[PDB]
Every structure is written in C-alpha cells, then in structure tokens.
Amino acid sequence: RKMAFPSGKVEGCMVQVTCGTTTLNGLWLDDVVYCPRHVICTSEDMLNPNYEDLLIRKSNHNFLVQAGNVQLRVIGHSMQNCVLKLKVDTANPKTPKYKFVRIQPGQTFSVLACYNGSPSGVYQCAMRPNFTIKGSFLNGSCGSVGFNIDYDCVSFCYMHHMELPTGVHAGTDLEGNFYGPFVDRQTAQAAGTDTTITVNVLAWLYAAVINGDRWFLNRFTTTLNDFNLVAMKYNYEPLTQDHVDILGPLSAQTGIAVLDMCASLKELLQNGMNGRTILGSALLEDEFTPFDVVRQCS
Amino acid sequence: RKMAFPSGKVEGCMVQVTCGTTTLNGLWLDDVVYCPRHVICTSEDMLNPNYEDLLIRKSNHNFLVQAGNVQLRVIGHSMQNCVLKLKVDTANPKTPKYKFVRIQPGQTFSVLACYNGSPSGVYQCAMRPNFTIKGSFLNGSCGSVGFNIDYDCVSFCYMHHMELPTGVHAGTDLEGNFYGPFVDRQTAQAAGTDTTITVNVLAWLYAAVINGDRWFLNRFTTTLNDFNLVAMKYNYEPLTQDHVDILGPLSAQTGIAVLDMCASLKELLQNGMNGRTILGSALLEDEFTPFDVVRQCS
Ligand SMILES: *[C@H](O)[C@H](C[C@@H]1CCNC1=O)NC(=O)[C@H](CC(C)C)NC(=O)OCc1ccccc1
Ligand SMILES: *[C@H](O)[C@H](C[C@@H]1CCNC1=O)NC(=O)[C@H](CC(C)C)NC(=O)OCc1ccccc1
C-alpha cells in the first residue's frame, strides 16, 4: 500500500492568507506565516509580475491571516525567493518540532492538500526526475505543503504554487526556491521529459522478495553498465553506486546483492509481467523509496 | 490519486492498551477507551478463547492504558461483542464530534495504522463485497480504526482485528460486530469469493475522462438490465438504480449518460484493455466511490 504520514501535526499549522481577492494557504510555525508570494498578485499581475514592486505597495494591513475565523495580526512582511513571510503577533502553540529541507528527485513525501486553510485530504507522492509531482490540486490549493516525519520532527520539503500544462505540479522548498526550472508566473512552461526512478523500482522488487511472491524472480545476472542500456531505453534514471547502499538494508535482508535484481527488471522491460501483477500493481511501481519499503515491512 | 481524509482528529484519540503480555491500540473518546477484546487473551488463549471466561477472570488493574506518556486509570470495563470498553477517570479533551457507523460493501474509509498507541501511517480502503479489506497491517496494529469525515464529524466505521491467510484483513464496526463471517479466534478462516465493485469502477472511468483519458469511450448504449447480465459473468456486483442516481453528478459534469458509460465498460469486459492503461493502470480500479471522485475533482 501507498501510505501517508499522519497529518495532525501539519494540520495544526495551516492557515488562510488573503490579500485583496486571492486566498491561499499559509504555514504557521512559531510567529511566522509562510505562503506563496503570488498571493499579492491580482488576476493579471500573474502573467508578468514584478513581485518586488507589487510587494512595495503592500503593507502589513493588506494581509488577512485567519486560523479558523480568528484573525491573526500581521506585524511584518518579507519576501524570500518565491515565498512570503508574514510575522504575526501570536506564536502557533501547535508548532511541531520541525525543519526545512530540500529533497532530491526520487525522494517521497506526503502532501496535505488544503483549501481556504482547511485540510481536505492527504496523499503520498514523489518528486519526479523532472521536478514535477503527480498530485491532485485544484484552485485555492497553493500554499499546501509536503512533508516527512522522523520521530517527532516534521521535515517540510514542498509548498505548492502551480499546475503545469500536462496536469502535474510545481513548487518550491520552504525557502521559496522552486524545484526545477519553473517560475511563479502564469505562462506555458516546459514540463520536461521524465524518467523512471530506478532505485525505487529496485526497492519495490526487493519488497516482492521479502513479502513473498517473487515470480518475476529469474535466473540471470548482469553488472552495472549494460543494465543501464536496454532500460535507459524504457527511460530509467542512472542508478549511481550511492543509491546502491541506501538499497543496502534490503539487499542484506533478502540476501540479494543489487543485481540478480537488475536482471529481473530486465525481463519486465523485456517481455512485461506477462499480464501478471507484483504486490498489487499490474505495472512496475517507482514511487517507493527503500526507506518506504523498510518502514512498511517494519 | 487515492486520498485519505486528514487524520489529526483521530490521532488525538489513539492510546495504547495493555493487558499482561498483550499490547494493542485503543480509541479514546470522552471517558471511554474501545479496543479489540482479544487484548485479554494470551498467545495460547487466542487459539480458542471463551472471552467471557477470560473477562470475568479480570479486574480493572489488569488493563494498562497509556496516552503518550500519561497513564489513564481504568475504573470500569465491559464487553460489547468483539470490542472491550474501558472506562477511565479522565475524558479525552481532544475528543472530536464523532459517530459510529456500519458501512456497506463498496464504501471507502481512511485507515490510521497505529503501533503502541502511536500513529504510523494513513491510507484508503474499501469494504470488499466479501467484507474483507486489502490493508497494510502488522503485529501491534489491532485497535487501529477506519473513518470518514463529514465537515467536522469523524464517523468511525472499522476497527482492526485480523489478517486472513490470503493477506487481506478483517474486523468490526465500533460496536464490535465483524464485517463478514469471521471470528476473533486465531484459526485459519477463508473469506469467500470476492466480486468487483461496479458502481466504483464507473466512478473511476468518469474520473479518467475528467483527467483526459478517453480512449475507452464507445458510442454504443445499453439497458441497465442488459448491463447487469454481462457484468454478472465477470463477477461484477449488480448495478442498482440507486447506484445510477449516485453517478448522476459525474454524468452531468462530463455529459456522458451512466448507461452509455456502462456500454463502454461492457466493451472493456468483453475485449480486455489490449495493453492500454486507464489513468496509468492495467486493471480497472474499483476502490473509488462516486463521492471520492467528486470530492477530489471539486
Ligand atoms: C494556486 O492556488 C494555484 C494552483 C493551481 C490551480 C489549479 N491547480 C493548481 O495546481 N496556482 C495558480 O493558479 C497559478 C498562479 C501563478 C501565479 C503561478 N497559475 C497556474 O497554475 O497556471 C498554470 C496552469 C497551467 C495549466 C493548467 C492549470 C494551471
Ligand atoms: C492484532 O494486533 C493482530 C494484527 C494482525 C497481525 C499481523 N497482521 C494483522 O493484521 N491480530 C491477530 O494476530 C489475530 C488475533 C485474533 C485472531 C485473536 N490473528 C491474526 O491476525 O492472524 C494471525 C497472524 C499473526 C502474524 C502474522 C499474520 C497473521
């Protein structure tokens, strides 16, 4: 099963930010509210916004932050890359222990989709090699965050800004820097040709070996270099050698060093599953980290 | 995408319940903790328990409940079918507006998987027509619950007790009545042959149209009864008029009559998918309801 982190600690940080006509969501940690900076744009400064001068003309009194129907007072505003920061006069007493990280393509996280500051639902998604995510997001959803958890700490890794022509989504880390070559302005922009997350496909074959039925399992072996070619053709990312021993635990538990493994991914890009399905998916699955496999078998 | 309801309201009601060697999760609402009654069994008892034998042989102090760090004093106990009800001297201040509901086959709910009283993950499930669910659950997971939300109100519908031999799962409503012909005994049980949830498959074909994927549309048309005849043969639940009604929503926003979308699915069942995906998959997905489709497309 694809599984999301429990969302309570992030729900307790979600607020509604309105500036003029635009409402979106804010992230309220301590006495600071983070939200996408295009909240300060009207329907039409959005096509080529000069954010610096948009923001000049805004003052604290132009921002309506609400936790429920309770207004939080804005007492300062600043722009950091593509996110806005609003100092409010109340520290969120729900503030989890947390930090801001910038994730890598292939890494997974959980999205807490919200609308008008109220959580709608939660889902697990991955950062594609072309820096999009395959999410469900509608209008008013910008400012929603992705996150991971480690014990008590919430690691905020994504904030939402944009849908792309092809239906996928684009956003920034919590310091406002976009993932990939995207800009927060309403223009057609390059999706970018995507690839399969090789390390996660191997994580998930391992899960097959663990949780039982390894029918895919075949009796042939390879090394690193040829492995790249015929699948690089079905468009698979370079497995390095340091994806390698994040796959170390799963190799040690199954007994299988990385490459009998490769050579059965061969045959699944060499003559399909033969109509068969591994663990619940009639296709190869590439949105499970090795850590995702260990967590869930753990 | 499969989207679970946000989980914070349930997370604040989850506690650990211990009785001797046996530990699992409980649901802490007002001044009552509910958990699976096989918490009272030893490894050996669970072979063939007479739960009323076992329960008359215990007093309050044999139950240890913990809410994070803090122990809750059990001051009463009580059994309602397959769930135990433990009264405690404190009311859970995080108790939401809630309800207890028994759901029908085909309905969905989100599951908050917990271990030792602590949330670990959240995902969606359907009640199969055979009254099992295709979960992800290990030892210590019992007591985790399934629920839906409805504005402010968490309606609990599932409590977890068991993995059948085939890897699927079985449990009770929160009054403790099993979904299906199972019992809280550790003895091998079979679930009975599953069917496919038809009304949901149509809801996912509609979902697919909305998201640009329309190769499967035909322009044949069919009777409700003609459709159920063919469907039957492929082990699809009857499609009721109610189900037709329920689909009406999605039938407006796409301009496809239910019955014509039946015609297309009927062609899908007589001829297979010949190598094509719908919404990415080589199988027809039946674990989205109408309501889960609207919710995530409005
Ligand atoms: C912010 O709430 C919103 C999120 C979008 C809207 C629907 N689904 C989403 O992901 N962002 C915008 O509406 C964005 C504002 C600009 C200042 C970046 N405009 C936008 O998303 O245009 C790109 C697009 C291309 C194709 C379809 C839909 C949107
Ligand atoms: C409750 O904590 C536990 C959850 C099972 C354990 C593995 N995955 C689950 O969902 N329930 C039981 O152990 C249950 C006990 C009642 C029948 C008294 N028996 C059961 O689920 O099947 C036994 C089993 C044990 C270990 C692995 C797989 C199945």
XYZ file of C-alpha atoms and ligand atoms in Angstrom:
654
model
C 0.000 0.000 0.000
C 0.966 3.628 -0.698
C 0.922 5.226 2.768
C 0.946 8.828 4.015
C 2.289 10.139 7.298
C -0.324 11.084 9.903
C -1.155 14.695 9.133
C -2.247 16.069 12.579
C 0.942 17.960 13.334
C 0.807 19.738 9.952
C -2.959 20.356 10.056
C -2.336 22.329 13.267
C -0.155 24.751 11.259
C -2.469 25.511 8.313
C -3.975 28.993 7.973
C -5.710 31.080 5.335
C -3.927 34.054 3.783
C -5.821 36.635 1.821
C -4.560 39.724 0.040
C -7.164 41.583 -1.964
C -9.093 38.925 -3.869
C -6.636 35.993 -3.789
C -6.986 33.487 -0.955
C -4.476 30.698 -0.449
C -2.982 28.712 2.462
C -0.249 29.633 4.938
C 2.195 27.603 7.063
C 2.112 28.974 10.648
C 5.232 27.980 12.581
C 6.013 29.969 15.729
C 5.220 33.626 14.924
C 5.782 33.432 11.154
C 3.359 32.561 8.331
C 4.878 31.187 5.090
C 2.827 31.315 1.891
C 3.458 31.591 -1.888
C 4.247 35.159 -2.854
C 1.731 35.287 -5.706
C -0.997 35.895 -3.103
C -0.076 39.578 -3.600
C -0.886 39.398 -7.344
C -4.222 40.191 -8.886
C -5.715 38.167 -11.665
C -3.356 39.683 -14.166
C -0.242 40.765 -12.471
C 0.120 36.975 -12.602
C 1.187 36.901 -16.257
C 4.310 39.006 -15.739
C 4.510 40.061 -12.082
C 7.127 42.464 -10.796
C 6.888 40.992 -7.306
C 9.330 43.468 -5.823
C 7.043 46.421 -6.674
C 3.801 44.529 -6.093
C 5.164 43.900 -2.582
C 6.291 47.521 -2.145
C 2.683 48.611 -2.488
C 1.505 46.133 0.101
C 1.701 46.818 3.805
C 1.023 44.655 6.857
C -2.608 45.891 6.882
C -3.168 44.374 3.426
C -2.747 40.783 4.675
C -5.697 38.882 6.203
C -4.406 35.771 8.013
C -7.029 33.548 9.662
C -6.756 30.454 11.856
C -10.379 29.419 11.633
C -12.412 32.596 11.816
C -9.826 34.028 14.221
C -7.800 36.779 12.609
C -4.045 36.763 13.253
C -2.496 40.242 13.231
C 0.239 40.828 10.664
C 3.134 42.863 12.118
C 5.741 42.409 9.425
C 6.158 41.062 5.896
C 9.131 39.945 3.819
C 9.782 38.082 0.579
C 12.297 35.193 0.394
C 12.619 33.940 -3.198
C 9.060 32.840 -4.078
C 7.553 32.648 -0.617
C 6.162 35.393 1.528
C 6.806 35.584 5.250
C 4.353 37.408 7.494
C 5.286 37.948 11.094
C 2.081 37.672 13.187
C 1.648 38.689 16.802
C 0.898 35.120 18.053
C 3.212 32.116 18.150
C 1.427 28.979 16.989
C 1.152 26.847 20.172
C 0.629 23.859 17.862
C 4.049 24.399 16.354
C 5.652 20.975 15.985
C 9.343 20.408 16.169
C 10.285 20.834 12.567
C 12.789 21.946 9.995
C 13.008 22.861 6.329
C 14.769 20.524 3.911
C 15.242 20.455 0.138
C 14.519 16.993 -1.226
C 16.145 15.110 -4.134
C 14.370 13.738 -7.199
C 13.171 10.291 -6.315
C 12.569 11.153 -2.649
C 8.982 10.765 -1.420
C 6.892 12.913 0.915
C 3.269 13.411 1.982
C 1.034 16.237 0.670
C -1.659 17.746 2.929
C -3.965 19.375 0.405
C -5.903 22.336 1.732
C -8.471 24.859 0.502
C -9.127 28.100 2.393
C -6.800 26.920 5.134
C -8.772 23.776 5.832
C -7.215 20.357 5.246
C -9.111 18.391 2.540
C -7.060 15.197 2.349
C -3.623 13.627 2.377
C -1.632 11.634 -0.145
C 1.818 10.244 -0.818
C 3.618 11.414 -3.939
C 7.163 11.520 -5.257
C 9.409 14.185 -6.694
C 9.814 13.061 -10.346
C 13.233 13.248 -12.026
C 11.896 16.319 -13.975
C 10.987 18.112 -10.726
C 7.238 17.792 -11.057
C 4.940 15.873 -8.744
C 1.917 13.882 -9.855
C -0.563 15.478 -7.470
C -4.223 16.307 -7.204
C -4.524 20.072 -6.622
C -7.344 22.444 -7.548
C -7.775 26.219 -7.282
C -7.077 27.661 -3.804
C -4.652 24.774 -3.089
C -1.420 26.788 -3.343
C 0.408 27.008 -0.038
C -0.287 23.363 0.769
C 2.863 21.616 1.932
C 4.585 18.295 1.502
C 6.432 16.812 4.449
C 8.215 13.871 6.002
C 8.422 12.871 9.668
C 11.332 11.442 11.685
C 10.227 10.609 15.248
C 8.811 13.948 16.403
C 10.216 16.230 13.707
C 8.220 17.360 10.685
C 10.547 17.975 7.718
C 8.788 20.447 5.409
C 10.048 19.919 1.862
C 7.463 21.324 -0.572
C 4.997 24.183 -0.871
C 2.535 24.325 -3.776
C 2.354 27.042 -6.455
C 1.444 25.756 -9.905
C -0.180 23.241 -12.226
C 1.704 22.622 -15.493
C 0.133 22.271 -18.949
C 0.382 18.476 -18.726
C -1.502 18.237 -15.418
C 1.413 17.854 -12.985
C 2.545 20.256 -10.310
C 5.421 22.535 -9.464
C 6.543 24.202 -6.300
C 9.284 25.349 -4.009
C 11.060 24.249 -0.871
C 10.171 26.272 2.256
C 12.809 28.857 1.451
C 10.984 29.718 -1.775
C 13.349 28.121 -4.319
C 11.473 26.257 -6.977
C 12.024 22.649 -7.757
C 13.210 22.718 -11.332
C 13.188 25.385 -13.960
C 9.834 26.898 -13.082
C 8.871 30.469 -12.310
C 5.854 31.702 -10.390
C 4.196 33.402 -13.327
C 1.327 32.194 -15.479
C 2.977 31.145 -18.701
C 3.095 27.857 -20.521
C 6.273 26.247 -19.311
C 8.291 23.154 -20.062
C 7.151 20.005 -18.344
C 10.466 18.377 -19.123
C 10.948 14.790 -20.260
C 10.509 12.361 -17.387
C 12.164 9.085 -16.443
C 11.627 6.119 -14.154
C 13.146 6.201 -10.659
C 15.433 3.202 -10.885
C 16.401 2.978 -7.203
C 12.702 2.874 -6.195
C 11.867 0.166 -8.746
C 14.606 -1.930 -7.186
C 13.333 -1.094 -3.709
C 9.972 -2.496 -4.737
C 11.262 -5.671 -6.347
C 13.043 -6.302 -3.029
C 9.729 -5.824 -1.290
C 8.414 -8.521 -3.624
C 11.163 -10.890 -2.487
C 10.513 -10.051 1.189
C 6.707 -10.206 1.386
C 6.737 -13.430 -0.521
C 5.875 -13.977 -4.135
C 8.898 -13.301 -6.321
C 7.586 -14.841 -9.567
C 9.401 -12.113 -11.546
C 12.488 -13.681 -9.979
C 14.666 -15.040 -12.754
C 17.955 -16.870 -13.044
C 20.287 -14.448 -14.808
C 22.756 -11.786 -13.714
C 24.458 -8.674 -15.033
C 26.702 -5.821 -13.955
C 26.176 -2.058 -13.752
C 26.913 -0.786 -17.244
C 24.842 -2.964 -19.608
C 21.953 -2.775 -17.071
C 21.729 0.931 -17.937
C 21.294 0.499 -21.674
C 18.194 -1.538 -22.582
C 16.188 0.060 -19.736
C 17.623 3.595 -20.217
C 15.712 2.870 -23.399
C 12.460 2.328 -21.479
C 13.801 5.513 -19.837
C 15.281 4.729 -16.426
C 17.425 7.083 -14.397
C 21.115 6.378 -13.748
C 21.423 4.132 -10.791
C 24.617 5.527 -9.301
C 26.596 3.465 -6.729
C 25.199 5.504 -3.743
C 21.684 4.803 -4.427
C 23.458 1.473 -4.039
C 23.711 1.234 -0.274
C 20.587 3.060 0.536
C 19.436 -0.252 -1.045
C 21.870 -1.966 1.325
C 19.419 -2.948 4.041
C 17.055 -4.605 1.564
C 19.926 -6.460 -0.060
C 21.133 -7.716 3.324
C 17.646 -8.845 4.493
C 16.790 -10.709 1.263
C 20.348 -11.967 0.664
C 20.290 -10.339 -2.786
C 23.090 -8.014 -3.786
C 21.749 -5.483 -6.197
C 21.989 -7.395 -9.415
C 20.206 -10.683 -9.761
C 17.669 -7.896 -9.054
C 18.512 -5.742 -12.081
C 18.343 -8.841 -14.291
C 14.659 -9.424 -13.405
C 13.852 -5.760 -14.056
C 15.433 -6.655 -17.402
C 12.787 -9.229 -18.200
C 9.905 -6.986 -17.013
C 11.128 -4.376 -19.508
C 11.913 -7.361 -21.779
C 8.506 -9.042 -22.020
C 6.218 -7.377 -19.490
C 4.851 -9.099 -16.388
C 3.080 -11.404 -18.879
C -0.197 -9.879 -17.709
C 0.797 -10.566 -14.071
C 0.969 -8.193 -11.120
C 3.512 -7.798 -8.326
C 2.102 -6.936 -4.876
C -0.989 -5.125 -6.245
C 0.188 -3.304 -9.397
C -0.135 -4.677 -12.935
C 2.829 -2.398 -13.736
C 6.220 -1.670 -12.218
C 5.964 0.798 -9.317
C 8.575 3.538 -8.867
C 7.228 5.723 -6.030
C 8.509 3.672 -3.099
C 11.828 4.663 -1.518
C 13.941 1.903 0.022
C 13.036 3.591 3.279
C 9.395 3.378 2.246
C 9.774 -0.395 1.919
C 11.547 -0.828 5.279
C 9.130 1.428 7.201
C 6.139 -0.555 5.939
C 7.610 -4.060 6.383
C 8.754 -2.865 9.848
C -4.977 9.681 -6.700
C -6.124 7.778 -3.604
C -6.649 10.480 -0.964
C -7.243 9.807 2.714
C -9.076 12.164 4.985
C -6.728 14.237 7.168
C -6.012 12.256 10.308
C -5.338 14.711 13.187
C -8.785 14.354 14.746
C -8.283 10.546 15.055
C -4.625 10.781 16.103
C -5.611 12.640 19.273
C -7.856 9.745 20.363
C -5.318 6.903 19.956
C -3.934 5.187 23.068
C -2.061 2.031 23.945
C -3.891 -0.692 25.819
C -2.050 -3.446 27.598
C -3.287 -6.499 29.447
C -0.420 -8.735 30.501
C 1.768 -9.810 27.651
C -0.580 -8.396 25.004
C -0.412 -4.808 23.677
C -2.516 -3.054 21.095
C -4.238 0.236 20.317
C -7.431 1.758 21.644
C -9.729 4.608 20.729
C -10.107 7.192 23.499
C -13.409 9.098 23.234
C -14.817 11.083 26.200
C -14.024 8.809 29.191
C -14.056 5.503 27.317
C -11.329 3.524 25.543
C -12.511 0.940 22.982
C -10.171 -1.763 21.711
C -10.343 -5.314 20.346
C -11.318 -7.714 23.113
C -8.611 -10.242 22.227
C -6.269 -7.939 24.208
C -7.380 -10.118 27.123
C -6.036 -13.297 25.537
C -2.574 -14.789 25.962
C -0.858 -16.343 22.897
C -2.488 -19.602 23.989
C -5.944 -18.236 24.787
C -6.210 -16.861 21.269
C -6.201 -20.433 19.949
C -9.776 -20.989 21.253
C -10.953 -18.262 23.644
C -14.088 -18.144 25.662
C -13.881 -14.399 26.068
C -16.422 -14.306 28.885
C -14.379 -16.883 30.795
C -11.330 -14.692 30.216
C -13.063 -11.439 31.013
C -14.784 -12.497 34.250
C -11.309 -13.522 35.373
C -10.018 -9.930 35.226
C -10.317 -6.616 37.035
C -9.525 -3.042 36.104
C -5.894 -3.105 37.215
C -5.073 -5.841 34.700
C -5.578 -3.213 31.948
C -2.916 -0.586 31.388
C -3.897 2.311 29.134
C -1.393 4.978 28.124
C -1.941 8.254 26.293
C 1.566 9.022 25.141
C 3.454 9.283 28.415
C 0.481 9.556 30.718
C -1.204 6.547 32.278
C -5.001 6.566 32.380
C -6.648 4.855 35.354
C -9.111 2.198 34.227
C -12.132 2.389 36.534
C -14.510 0.171 34.547
C -14.560 -2.495 31.875
C -17.209 -4.063 29.760
C -17.543 -6.097 26.578
C -19.787 -5.351 23.576
C -19.389 -8.225 21.104
C -15.750 -8.226 19.942
C -14.703 -4.881 21.443
C -13.785 -4.088 25.029
C -14.963 -0.832 26.631
C -12.663 0.528 29.372
C -13.851 3.482 31.426
C -11.122 5.814 32.649
C -11.249 8.627 35.182
C -10.459 11.265 32.551
C -12.290 12.403 29.457
C -10.168 12.878 26.353
C -10.118 16.661 25.831
C -9.256 16.008 22.159
C -12.490 14.035 21.614
C -13.988 15.256 18.324
C -17.541 15.298 17.172
C -17.882 11.626 16.189
C -20.311 8.879 15.291
C -20.255 5.119 14.929
C -21.427 3.844 11.530
C -21.655 0.447 9.868
C -20.671 0.819 6.229
C -21.818 -1.123 3.145
C -19.654 -3.124 0.757
C -18.071 -0.850 -1.784
C -17.877 2.164 0.573
C -14.426 3.577 1.414
C -12.828 4.974 4.573
C -9.363 6.016 5.540
C -7.321 3.910 7.944
C -4.891 5.322 10.546
C -2.456 2.492 11.196
C -1.016 2.655 14.706
C 1.599 0.770 16.754
C 1.947 1.026 20.560
C -0.688 3.793 20.648
C 1.216 5.952 18.125
C 0.068 6.802 14.598
C 2.337 5.447 11.897
C 0.542 5.932 8.542
C -2.768 6.631 6.757
C -4.410 5.184 3.645
C -7.733 4.442 1.954
C -9.592 1.137 1.805
C -12.884 -0.223 0.575
C -15.075 -2.771 2.265
C -14.909 -5.590 -0.284
C -18.187 -7.316 -1.188
C -16.807 -10.276 0.835
C -16.354 -7.989 3.878
C -12.551 -8.074 3.954
C -10.188 -5.206 3.247
C -6.871 -5.036 1.408
C -4.927 -3.333 4.165
C -1.345 -2.911 5.278
C -1.161 -4.102 8.897
C 1.431 -5.922 11.066
C 1.580 -7.165 14.675
C 0.525 -4.479 17.139
C -1.845 -2.884 14.608
C -5.062 -4.103 16.181
C -7.144 -1.301 17.521
C -6.317 0.919 14.541
C -9.512 2.385 13.129
C -11.034 3.446 9.807
C -13.167 6.511 9.437
C -14.613 9.127 7.191
C -15.065 12.826 7.904
C -18.053 14.947 7.083
C -17.322 18.632 7.767
C -16.498 18.473 11.488
C -17.657 14.914 12.318
C -15.473 11.803 12.329
C -17.736 8.800 11.685
C -15.870 5.652 12.767
C -16.707 2.538 10.845
C -13.903 -0.007 11.232
C -11.715 -1.468 13.947
C -8.955 -3.867 13.094
C -8.528 -7.420 14.499
C -7.115 -9.861 11.969
C -5.165 -10.858 8.877
C -6.692 -13.808 6.977
C -4.296 -16.347 5.342
C -4.619 -14.667 1.953
C -3.087 -11.438 3.327
C -6.356 -9.456 3.461
C -7.867 -8.149 6.708
C -10.967 -8.459 8.837
C -12.601 -6.515 11.590
C -15.522 -4.969 13.284
C -17.596 -1.921 13.474
C -17.079 0.034 16.720
C -19.998 -1.845 18.308
C -17.738 -4.875 17.690
C -19.711 -6.810 15.076
C -17.482 -8.343 12.423
C -17.747 -7.366 8.824
C -18.299 -10.838 7.329
C -18.314 -14.473 8.553
C -15.193 -14.266 10.740
C -14.467 -14.554 14.443
C -11.806 -13.156 16.769
C -10.126 -16.578 17.023
C -6.625 -17.334 15.739
C -7.730 -20.170 13.439
C -7.471 -20.237 9.654
C -10.517 -18.603 8.066
C -11.487 -18.106 4.435
C -13.264 -15.010 3.174
C -15.335 -16.209 0.314
C -15.006 -15.286 -3.328
C -14.777 -11.557 -3.987
C -16.605 -9.650 -6.694
C -15.735 -6.295 -8.286
C -17.411 -3.097 -7.053
C -19.122 -1.951 -10.264
C -20.504 1.427 -9.245
C -16.991 2.395 -8.182
C -15.423 1.243 -11.464
C -17.767 3.518 -13.366
C -16.828 6.316 -10.942
C -13.161 5.766 -11.910
C -13.911 5.685 -15.646
C -15.605 9.068 -15.165
C -12.577 10.123 -13.123
C -10.438 9.066 -16.071
C -12.423 11.091 -18.631
C -12.086 14.237 -16.478
C -8.327 13.676 -16.487
C -8.073 13.470 -20.293
C -8.086 9.685 -20.732
C -10.948 8.808 -23.083
C -9.763 6.056 -25.398
C -12.276 3.650 -23.794
C -15.382 5.658 -24.646
C -17.550 3.969 -27.269
C -20.861 5.241 -28.569
C -22.933 2.123 -28.007
C -25.762 2.301 -25.497
C -27.237 -0.232 -23.144
C -30.036 -1.037 -20.745
C -29.383 -1.212 -17.028
C -30.563 -4.830 -17.161
C -28.573 -5.677 -20.258
C -25.539 -4.275 -18.471
C -26.082 -6.348 -15.307
C -26.389 -9.568 -17.338
C -22.955 -9.200 -18.918
C -21.445 -7.765 -15.724
C -22.532 -10.782 -13.662
C -20.466 -13.087 -15.840
C -17.309 -11.165 -14.989
C -18.081 -11.212 -11.251
C -19.304 -7.616 -11.000
C -21.843 -6.607 -8.355
C -25.262 -5.674 -9.722
C -25.571 -2.012 -10.642
C -28.657 -0.643 -8.856
C -30.795 2.309 -9.939
C -29.618 3.958 -6.726
C -26.064 3.474 -7.980
C -27.201 5.048 -11.274
C -28.551 8.026 -9.338
C -25.379 8.286 -7.314
C -23.417 8.503 -10.579
C -25.714 11.305 -11.895
C -23.420 14.009 -10.604
C -20.411 12.801 -12.589
C -22.771 12.254 -15.552
C -23.626 15.949 -15.659
C -20.093 17.341 -15.452
C -18.925 15.041 -18.276
C -22.004 14.818 -20.491
C -21.883 11.000 -20.558
C -25.022 9.165 -19.503
C -24.397 6.435 -16.949
C -25.840 3.824 -19.259
C -23.573 4.798 -22.139
C -20.610 4.622 -19.777
C -21.941 1.186 -18.903
C -21.814 0.328 -22.599
C -18.150 1.284 -22.739
C -17.264 -0.721 -19.606
C -19.197 -3.672 -21.058
C -16.944 -3.493 -24.146
C -13.955 -3.229 -21.805
C -15.009 -6.536 -20.142
C -15.652 -8.483 -23.380
C -12.356 -7.418 -25.044
C -9.769 -6.668 -22.311
C -7.698 -3.488 -22.324
C -5.287 -4.627 -25.066
C -2.187 -3.184 -23.434
C -3.604 0.235 -22.662
C -3.706 1.993 -19.357
C -6.588 3.872 -17.867
C -5.305 6.554 -15.514
C -1.991 4.701 -15.604
C -3.138 1.175 -14.689
C -3.585 -2.174 -16.483
C -6.624 -3.069 -14.329
C -9.966 -1.403 -13.702
C -9.901 0.249 -10.291
C -12.923 -0.318 -8.031
C -11.833 1.300 -4.701
C -13.004 4.839 -5.514
C -16.646 5.655 -4.910
C -18.633 8.346 -6.687
C -18.175 10.523 -3.620
C -14.396 10.081 -3.541
C -14.335 11.087 -7.211
C -16.346 14.299 -6.841
C -14.550 15.288 -3.571
C -11.197 15.088 -5.427
C -12.449 16.813 -8.610
C -14.325 19.694 -6.912
C -2.619 28.359 -6.643
O -3.623 28.115 -5.777
C -2.802 27.664 -7.970
C -2.695 26.156 -8.006
C -3.103 25.550 -9.406
C -4.566 25.932 -9.774
C -5.268 24.691 -10.142
N -4.331 23.527 -9.867
C -3.013 24.096 -9.409
O -2.058 23.451 -9.180
N -1.774 28.295 -8.803
C -2.177 29.021 -9.997
O -3.364 29.058 -10.234
C -1.031 29.677 -10.810
C -0.747 31.062 -10.278
C 0.543 31.581 -10.910
C 0.979 32.865 -10.177
C 1.752 30.648 -10.840
N -1.437 29.675 -12.187
C -1.346 28.397 -12.862
O -1.403 27.421 -12.193
O -1.175 28.361 -14.260
C -0.505 27.213 -14.730
C -1.537 26.176 -15.230
C -1.338 25.511 -16.453
C -2.274 24.584 -16.899
C -3.392 24.319 -16.106
C -3.591 24.968 -14.881
C -2.662 25.905 -14.445
C -3.690 -7.522 16.112
O -2.628 -6.813 16.707
C -3.183 -8.587 15.111
C -2.963 -7.971 13.726
C -2.582 -8.994 12.561
C -1.130 -9.456 12.811
C -0.444 -9.429 11.508
N -1.239 -8.517 10.600
C -2.579 -8.310 11.275
O -3.444 -7.646 10.817
N -4.259 -9.607 15.106
C -4.031 -11.055 15.294
O -2.951 -11.511 15.495
C -5.221 -12.039 15.223
C -5.543 -12.398 16.641
C -7.044 -12.663 16.759
C -7.467 -13.691 15.733
C -7.241 -13.255 18.153
N -4.785 -13.128 14.379
C -4.288 -12.797 13.023
O -4.341 -11.698 12.603
O -3.697 -13.764 12.179
C -2.544 -14.240 12.828
C -1.255 -13.685 12.212
C -0.132 -13.476 13.020
C 1.039 -12.992 12.456
C 1.088 -12.722 11.091
C -0.037 -12.931 10.299
C -1.219 -13.420 10.856
